[PDB]
From Swiss-Prot, chain B:
Any one biological process term the GO annotation gives: tetrahydrofolate interconversion
Catalyzed chemical reaction(s): (6S)-5,6,7,8-tetrahydrofolate + formate + ATP = (6R)-10-formyltetrahydrofolate + ADP + phosphate
Annotated protein name in UniProt: Formate--tetrahydrofolate ligase
Recorded family membership: Belongs to the formate--tetrahydrofolate ligase family.
Enzyme's top EC category: ligase
Source species taxonomy: Bacteria, Bacillati, Bacillota, Clostridia, Moorellales
Single GO term (MF): ATP binding
Organism: Moorella thermoacetica (strain ATCC 39073 / JCM 9320)
Length: 557, 555
C-alpha cells in the first residue's frame, strides 16, 4: 500500500497559510507570506494575546535511539492530526532541519508517511532563510573579532584563546581544523580555528531561547568570544557586534507557519543540536502556539534522557512553561535491540529480549515522572511485530503505571493516532501535572551535573579530568556557576558508552571538557568527542541528486 | 532629506498589482511579503515569440572619487519614460550584504531615483546570494570529500583553483590552510575565501538562459588538475545537479519597484573586473517581453562594463541594444582634468575641457559597437551654468545627443528631457549593433583588439606565466571563448594614476585565469581584490535596532 514519503508530500493538498492564520485569529497584517504555503508571523500576536490563558502543552519524546528507529516526529505530527480529527484546536511546533544532511545521507520528511509537515522540499532546503540569518550573524561576529585583532587589538585579546569559531550549514570535515589570517600584515592575524555546522551555532541556541528581538540582542551581547592576555573574558558586547547581529536576525526571530498533510497548522522555528544545546524548537514558536491553540504538541531531540530533560530544565525553566503531559515513543524492534538482539535479526519474535529491553523504556517513564508530568507510551506499529510481542509490551507498560497506545499514523495518518490522542486526552482530564524542574540553579556546577547523571542516567557518579576541573573552577569564578547545565553525551546509551544499550548499571560518567555558552545562558560539560561538524560519506547523496527541465527532482529522498 | 528617509516615505504598491498590470499571471508570482516577489521563467517561455521591446544600456565615464550617479540615472530615466506613458522596466544588480556592515549600505540609485524596499535589498533580500554561497561551497565540500575518500580522480590538492565564499568582508579568510587534524579530518591544503558576489556561480547565474543551462554551466566548472595536468570539473564530481537544486529559486528574478512605482527587476550581482558586471540575462530577457522599453546597466565605466555587456551578455543572449546612455558629471570630468577631490567646489572651465577627453573616448567606443550613444550630464548643485554649457557644447561638437538630468533632485520629471532624446534616438536612429570580435580569434588577438580599440593602448605585453597559462588553455580547447579583462576601472590604462585619455602606453597581462562554467577567459593586469576587508571603525559597530524595529547606523 503506502507510497513513498516524497510521493505522499507531492500529492498533498495544502491550504493557503493565510487561511490557516486567519482561522487561528491571526490578523492579515501579522502575516508575511513566502509564497502561499509558508508565512512568518509577527511577535505582535504573542504581545496582544499575552494575558490570554495558555493551552495544554504536550511534549513528545522517545526511548534511547537505536539503529532500528523509533518514529518520533511522525508521532508528533500524527498525534496533532488525530487531535484535530477529534475536534480539538491544536498546533504542532517543530524544528527546522539543517540543509547539510540533504546532500550527505538524507533528507527526509518532517515526519514520515501520512504524518508530515509541508512543503517538504522547502523545509529541507532554504525554507524561509532562518539558518542563513544564523550563519551570517555568527560569521559577522567572527569577522569583527578578526578585524579587531587586525586594527591594533585594543581589547588585548589573546588570539590563541578565541573560542568563537565560524559556521556553514554543510557537512564539511575539512573545515574542522584550519589556520586563518595568513599572507602577511595586510591580511590579518594568523590563528587556529575552524567551522561548525550552522545549527550547532550558539546563535541558533540563542534564537531558540530568546523571548523577543531585544532579548536576542541582549543575549548576543553576553556571548564570550575569548580572553585577554591577562585571562579576562571578552564579549560580543565589548566588540559592539550585538546590534548588527540582531539586525541580521530581524526576520529570523519570527516563527514560520506551515501545516500538516491534513492541513493542521504548524510552526517550524529554530533547530539546535541536542548534545551541546537543548534540542528544542523556539520558545517564540511554542509560546505563540499556546495562546493560539487549546493544545500544543512539540518535541525534543534524542531520547528522553537528553531532549526531554533539557526541554524541562532549560526551555520550560526560561519560558515559565508547565507541560501537561508527555508522550514517549517506542518500538518493538528498538526495545529488542536494547535487549541485545542484533539489527539483522529484529523480525524474529523474541519475547525474552523484548522484556529485557523494556528496561530502557521503563527508566524513561520513571524519569518523566520525576518532573511531575504524566506519561503516555506511543508504540509505533511495524509490520513484523507479532501480536504476542505487542501484547507483552502493553502489559509491561501497564505494570509500569503508564497508559499505552498503538500508533499507526505513518500508514493511516490522523486516523492512526486516535487511540493515542484519546489516551492523552484522558490523561489531561484526570491527572493534572505538577511540573517542576529537576534542579535548582544555585547548586554548584558539579552538584547539578551529578543530579542529572544520577537521577536521569542512573549513573553511580561522575568523574572529571583535570582540564574539566580547571574549567569549572574558572567559570564559577567568573560568575557563571548559577546557570543551567547542558550535558553533551552520546544519545545511544544512558551512559557515556554508546555500546551500553538497555538500562546499564554500575557505571560512571566522565566529564572531559566543560564549555560555556554565555549568550544562550548555560554550561556545557562534555563526555566524549562531540561531532560539531559531521562529514560527507563515501557516496554522498549530492552525486545522485538531479533536477530536470520540468523541475522534477531526483535523488533527494 | 536623506536617501533612507526618502525611501521610508515611499508609498509602495503591492508588487502583485504591478505584476498583473505587466500581464504576469498570479500563479507566476511568488511573494516575499507585499513588496517583493519572484517571477517564474514560464513568463519568458510563454511569451517566447511575443516581440522584444527596446533595449537601453546605461553606462558611465571612467569612475572617480567624485561619483557619477549611474544607477540614479538608470532609475530616473525609467521613471521619466513611465511619466511619458511608456511601458517600461528597469533591471538592476543585487548588492552584496557585506558592505552594509563595513562602509556602505546605500540606496539602489539615489535621492528621488531609487528602487525599494531599500533595506531588504541591502541585506538578505530574497536569498539569492545565500543560494549562490551554498551552491559554491557545496562544490568545495565535495572536492574536499573526494580527496578524503581515496582521491579517485587523482586531483593534486595543491592545484585546486576552486576557493570557498562568504558574503562578508573578511580579510582573515583570504589565505588559509584547511584539512588539518589528521586522517580523520581531511587532507591539508592551502585555499581561502572570496566574497560571494565574486563567485563563478554568481557569473553563471547571470549568464544562464534557464535552469538547465545553469546546470550544464556548472558541470563545466574547472576546480583543479590531476597530478598529470588534466582538468577536473564539477561534472566529474557529479556536483551540478545538487548545485542546480540549490539555485532552484534563485534562478527567478525579483520584482520590486521604483519610488514612483515603476516596475523594477533586481537579479544577480557579479564583479565587473573578473566578470562582466551585468544583472542577469534572465531578468533583461523577461523584461524585454513584458515591456516596450528596458533600461539596464553594467558595472564600472564604459570601457569595462559596456564592453562586457556588448561582448559577453548580448553575445550569449543574442540581444541587439537599441541605445546606450553614457552618464557623466562635471565634478568627475574635472578630476579627469586633474582637479583634486578637495577643490571641486571651485569652477574651472579649462580642467573640464581637458577632462572631457575621457567622455569623448567612451562616446567613440560606443559607436564602434554600432549603438547610438546619448549623454546624460548628472546635475550637481555645485555646477556652474558656464560649466554645464561648456559640456553641453562639447558633447554637441563631439557629435552626440546630450541632456541634463535632475532626477536625483526632481525624480522622473528630472529625466523627461533625457527620455525624449532617448525616445527620439529610438524612433529615428536605428542601432547597427555588433560585437567587437569573433570568438574564432586567438586569445592574444582578442585582448589586443580590446586593448587597442577600446582602451586606446599601443599594444599589450605578457608575463611568462601569462604566456604559459594561455598556451595551456588553448591546448585544452578553451581558446574560442570571450575575454573578460580584469583591470583597474579608474583609467583606460592598467595604471590607475592615469586618468583622462592616456596615450602612448601598453597593457601588461600578468596572469590569466579561466571561468569555464561562465564561459570565459580572464586576463588580469594587476592584483584584484576578491575579498575586501572591514575598516578601522566598521559601520557594524554603530548599527542598532530598537524595540520598535527602528534601525540606526545602517545607511
Amino acid at each position: 500500500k503506502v507510497p513513498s514519503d516524497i510521493e505522499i508530500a507531492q500529492a498533498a493538498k495544502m491550504k493557503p497559510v493565510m487561511e490557516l492564520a486567519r482561522g487561528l485569529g491571526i490578523q492579515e497584517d501579522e502575516v508575511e507570506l513566502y509564497g502561499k504555503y509558508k508565512a512568518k508571523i509577527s511577535l505582535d500576536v504573542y504581545r496582544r494575546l499575552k494575558d490570554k490563558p495558555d493551552g495544554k502543552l504536550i511534549l513528545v519524546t522517545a526511548i534511547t535511539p537505536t539503529p532500528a528507529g523509533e518514529g518520533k516526529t511522525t508521532t508528533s505530527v500524527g498525534l496533532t492530526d488525530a487531535l484535530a480529527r477529534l475536534g480539538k484546536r491544536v498546533m504542532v511546533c517543530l524544528r527546522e532541519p539543517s540543509l547539510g544532511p540533504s546532500f550527505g545521507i538524507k533528507g527526509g520528511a518532517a515526519g514520515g508517511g501520512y504524518a508530515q509537515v509541508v512543503p517538504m522540499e522547502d523545509i529541507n532546503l532554504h525554507f524561509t532563510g532562518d539558518i542563513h540569518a544564523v550563519t551570517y550573524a555568527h560569521n559577522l561576529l567572527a569577522a569583527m573579532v578578526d578585524n579587531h585583532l587586525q586594527q591594533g587589538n585594543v581589547l588585548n585579546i589573546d588570539p590563541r584563546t578565541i573560542t568563537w569559531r565560524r559556521v556553514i550549514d554543510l557537512n564539511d570535515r575539512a573545515l574542522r581544523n584550519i589556520v586563518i589570517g595568513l599572507g602577511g600584515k595586510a591580511n590579518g592575524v594568523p590563528r587556529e580555528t575552524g567551522f561548525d555546522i550552522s545549527v550547532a551555532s550558539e546563535v541558533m541556541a540563542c534564537l531558540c531561547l530568546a523571548s523577543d528581538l531585544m532579548d536576542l540582542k541582549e543575549r548576543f551581547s553576553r556571548i564570550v568570544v575569548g580572553y585577554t592576555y591577562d585571562g579576562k573574558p571578552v564579549t560580543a558586547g565589548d566588540l559592539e557586534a550585538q546590534g548588527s547581529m540582531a539586525l541580521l536576525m530581524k526576520d529570523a526571530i519570527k516563527p514560520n507557519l506551515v501545516q500538516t498533510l491534513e492541513n493542521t497548522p504548524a510552526f517550524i522555528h529554530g533547530g539546535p543540536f541536542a548534545n551541546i544545546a537543548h534540542g528544542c524548537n523556539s520558545i517564540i514558536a511554542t509560546k505563540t502556539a499556546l495562546k493560539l491553540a487549546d493544545y500544543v504538541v512539540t518535541e525534543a531531540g534524542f531520547g528522553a534522557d537528553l531532549g526531554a530533560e533539557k526541554f524541562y530544565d532549560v526551555k520550560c525553566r526560561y519560558a515559565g512553561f508547565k507541560p501537561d503531559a508527555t508522550v514517549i515513543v517506542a518500538t518493538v524492534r528498538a526495545l529488542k535491540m536494547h535487549g541485545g538482539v542484533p539489527k539483522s535479526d529484529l523480525a524474529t519474535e523474541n519475547l525474552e529480549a523484548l522484556r529485557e529491553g523494556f528496561a530502557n523504556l521503563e527508566k524513561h517513564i520513571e524519569n518523566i515522572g520525576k518532573f511531575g508530568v504524566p506519561a503516555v507510551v506511543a508504540i509505533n506499529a511495524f509490520p513484523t511485530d507479532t501480536e504476542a510481542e505487542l501484547n507483552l509490551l502493553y502489559e509491561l507498560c501497564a505494570k509500569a503505571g503508564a497508559e499505552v497506545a498503538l500508533s499507526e499514523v505513518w500508514a493511516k495518518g490522523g486516523e492512526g493516532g486516535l487511540e493515542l490522542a484519546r489516551k492523552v486526552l484522558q490523561t489531561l482530564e484526570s491527572r493534572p501535572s505538577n511540573f517542576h524542574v529537576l534542579y535548582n540553579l544555585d547548586l554548584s556546577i558539579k552538584d547539578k551535573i551529578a543530579k542529572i547523571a544520577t537521577e536521569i542516567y542512573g549513573a553511580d557518579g561522575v568523574n572529571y579530568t583535570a582540564e574539566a576541573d580547571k574549567a569549572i573552577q574558572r567559570y564559577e569564578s567568573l560568575g557563571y556557576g548559577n546557570l543551567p547545565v547542558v550535558m553533551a553525551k552520546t544519545q545511544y546509551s544512558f551512559s557515556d558508552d554508546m555500546t551500553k544499550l538497555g538500562r546499564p548499571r554500575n557505571f560512571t560518567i566522565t566529564v572531559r571538557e566543560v564549555r560555556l555558552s554565555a549568550g544562550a545562558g548555560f554550561i556545557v560539560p562534555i563526555t566524549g568527542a562531540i561531532m560539531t561538524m559531521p562529514g560527507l560519506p563515501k557516496r554522498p547523496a549530492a552525486c545522485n541528486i538531479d533536477i530536470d527541465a520540468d523541475g522534477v527532482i531526483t535523488g533527494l529522498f
